[PDB]
């Protein structure tokens, strides 16, 4: 009689279809998903330092818009900018806005140090009804609106040496009045001109008198500029009118900081990978949640599923 001895392998009733080089659909005993396609819907507040902008864009927090005083000197790994954010101060623009936003985002700090600029012969601390604090007229906290003193505005020729071991970021501006009579009422001379320089750079800006559409009842504008001052260099501001002066400098750091646009709520939880949709698990190598990411994240791909076989071909009975 003898015996029979058969060699064989397992199978499962419920196999999984995968793709191969020679076949787009072959059933294997088991597989695992390589594309993360879901989020929790919230941004976990750990382990990255999250700063929710709430009503404030980064730039409004920088300049010191009245809704943003709580942000002074704060740091972040990720600044979260909300779609509802709006400005509630003097109407302004920033030539190169995207670059200023980027460089502050990447620096990751609003640390500010006041400095004693000698604004000899002018009136300081100008304010406006377009920028209220507690119903008083106010202005951007980090800027100083200079105007005539007893109908004179003597030329400004002011120096600030950088004797620190770090770089300084100065934010300053030019006021563009609505009319010639407004120019004279504020600065006591028919035009201004502003030249801000260091040993290695210079910027001059000309005010441009004219009407723009009223925003918070203001038809004038302020245009914002910036200057970085290296250790051993010197900031020189020279102007005859229309200067929106710096009150000091911001620290500029380097590191892992960034900014993200999202309306996702912040939650008390821990997740390494952040997207605008919310935090996502980072076990898988790929994800199709969002091209925009921060942290240790799977790589964005177009596919919504990629199944890696983790077993043999399934050959059911």
Partner 1 sequence: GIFGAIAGFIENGWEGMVDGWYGFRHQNSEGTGQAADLKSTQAAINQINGKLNRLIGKTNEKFHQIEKEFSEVEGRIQDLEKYVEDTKIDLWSYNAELLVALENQHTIDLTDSEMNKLFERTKKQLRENAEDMGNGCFKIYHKCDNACIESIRNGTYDHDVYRDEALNNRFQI
Ligand X SMILES: CC(=O)N[C@@H]1[C@@H](O)[C@H](O[C@@H]2O[C@H](CO[C@]3(C(=O)O)C[C@H](O)[C@@H](NC(C)=O)[C@H]([C@H](O)[C@H](O)CO)O3)[C@H](O)[C@H](O)[C@H]2O)[C@@H](CO)O[C@H]1O
Ligand Y SMILES: *[C@@H]1O[C@H](CO)[C@@H](O[C@@H]2O[C@H](CO)[C@@H](O[C@@H]3O[C@H](CO)[C@@H](O)[C@H](O)[C@@H]3O)[C@H](O)[C@H]2NC(C)=O)[C@H](O)[C@H]1NC(C)=O
Ligand Z SMILES: *[C@@H]1O[C@H](CO)[C@@H](O[C@@H]2O[C@H](CO)[C@@H](O[C@@H]3O[C@H](CO[C@H]4O[C@H](CO)[C@@H](O)[C@H](O)[C@@H]4O)[C@@H](O)[C@H](O[C@H]4O[C@H](CO)[C@@H](O)[C@H](O)[C@@H]4O)[C@@H]3O)[C@H](O)[C@H]2NC(C)=O)[C@H](O)[C@H]1NC(C)=O
- Determine contact, residues 226/171, Cβ cutoff 8 Å: yes
Q: Pick from 85, 90, 84: which is nearest to 71 by CA?
A: 85
Map residues 16-35 to x or -, x wherever contact with partner 1 holds by CB under 8 A.
--xxxxxxx-x-x---x-xx
Applying CB under 6 A, does 115 fall inside the site for ligand Y?
no
- Residue from 96, 115, 180, 263 binding ligand Y (CB under 6 A): 180
Q: What angle do CA 51, 56, 58 make, to 5 degrees?
A: 65
Query: Considering the rule CB under 6 A, would residue 219 count as an interface residue with ligand Z?
Result: no
Which x/- pattern, by CB under 8 A, does the window 77-96 give for its own copies?
----------------x---
Site for its own copies in 187-216 (CB under 8 A): 193, 195, 197-202, 204, 208, 210-213, 215
**Position 234 contacts its own copies (CB under 8 A):** yes
Q: Is 219 in the site for ligand Y (CB under 6 A)?
A: yes
The binder of partner 1 chosen from 1, 134, 150, 163 (CB under 8 A): 1
Q: For residue 178, how many other CB atoms are within 10 A of its CB?
A: 16
User: Residue 213 binds which one of partner 1, ligand X, ligand Y, none, with CB within 5 to 8 A depending on kind?
Assistant: ligand Y
Residue 316 binds which of partner 1, ligand Y, its own copies, none (CB < 5-8 A, kind-dependent): partner 1
User: At closest approach, how far in Å is the CB of 200 from its own copies?
Assistant: 8
Which of positions 266-285 make contact with ligand Z (CB under 6 A)?
283
User: Count residues contacting partner 1 (CB under 8 A)?
Assistant: 74
> For 139, which DSSP code?
-
Taking alpha carbons only, the member of 108, 226, 234 closest to residue 169 is: 226
Quick check: 151 binds its own copies (CB under 8 A)? no
239 - beta bridge partners?
156, 194
Per partner kind, with CB cut-offs from 5 to 8 A, the member of ligand Z, ligand X, ligand Y, none near residue 182 is ligand X
Chain centre to alpha carbon of residue 72: 15
Distance between CA atoms of residues 64 and 45, nearest Å: 25
Phi-psi region of 135 (alpha: psi -120 to 50; beta: other; left: phi over 0): left
CA–CA distance from 121 to each of 188, 240, 270 (Å)? Answer: 12, 11, 55
**Cβ atoms of 192 and 239 closer than 8 Å:** yes
Q: Among partner 1, its own copies, ligand X, none, what binds residue 128 when CB lies within 5 to 8 Å by partner kind? A: ligand X
Alpha-carbon gap, residue 309 to 47, rounded angstroms: 33
Determine if 185 is a binding residue for ligand Z (CB under 6 A): no
Find out whether the peptide bond into 47 is cis, omega within 30 degrees of 0.
yes
Q: Is 116 exposed, middle or buried (0-12, 13-18, 19+ CB in 10 A)?
A: exposed
- Give me the residues that bind ligand Z (CB under 6 A), please: 30, 32, 283, 310
- Give me the residues that bind ligand X (CB under 6 A), please: 126-130, 137, 145, 147, 177-178, 182, 185-186, 217-218, 220
- Give me the residues that bind ligand Y (CB under 6 A), please: 155, 157, 159, 179-180, 193, 195, 210-211, 213-214, 219, 234, 236, 238-240
- Give me the residues that bind its own copies (CB under 8 A), please: 93, 157, 159, 176, 193, 195, 197-202, 204, 208, 210-213, 215, 221, 233-234, 236, 238
């Amino acid at each position: 009689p003898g015996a029979t001895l058969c060699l064989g392998h397992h199978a499962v009733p419920n196999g999984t279809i995968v793709k191969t080089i020679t076949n787009d659909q072959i059933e294997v005993t088991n597989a695992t998903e390589l594309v993360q396609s879901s989020s929790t819907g919230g941004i976990c507040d750990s382990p990255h330092q999250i700063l929710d902008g709430e009503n404030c864009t980064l730039i409004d927090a920088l300049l010191g818009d009245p809704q943003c005083d709580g942000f002074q000197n704060k740091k972040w790994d990720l600044f979260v900018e909300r779609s509802k954010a709006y400005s509630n101060c003097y109407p302004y623009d920033v030539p190169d806005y995207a670059s200023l936003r980027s460089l502050v985002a990447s620096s990751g700090t609003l640390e500010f140090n006041n400095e004693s600029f000698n604004w000899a012969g002018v009136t300081q601390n100008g304010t406006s009804s377009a920028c209220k604090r507690r119903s008083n007229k106010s202005f951007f906290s980090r800027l100083n609106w200079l105007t005539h003193l007893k109908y004179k505005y003597p030329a400004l020729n002011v120096t600030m040496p950088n004797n620190e071991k770090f770089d300084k970021l100065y934010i300053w501006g030019v006021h563009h009045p609505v009319t010639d009579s407004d120019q004279i009422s504020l600065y006591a001379q028919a035009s201004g001109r502003i030249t801000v320089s260091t040993k290695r750079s210079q910027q001059t800006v000309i005010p441009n008198i004219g009407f723009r559409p009223r925003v918070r009842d203001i038809s004038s504008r302020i245009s914002i500029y910036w200057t970085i001052v290296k250790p051993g260099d010197i900031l020189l501001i020279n102007s005859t009118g229309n200067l929106i002066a710096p009150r000091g400098y911001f620290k500029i750091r380097s590191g892992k900081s960034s900014i993200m646009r999202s309306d996702a709520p912040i939650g008390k939880c821990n997740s390494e990978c952040i997207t605008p949709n919310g935090s996502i698990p980072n076990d898988k190598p790929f994800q199709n949640v969002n091209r925009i990411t921060y942290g240790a994240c799977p790589r964005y791909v177009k596919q919504n599923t990629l199944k890696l076989a983790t077993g043999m071909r399934n050959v059911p009975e």
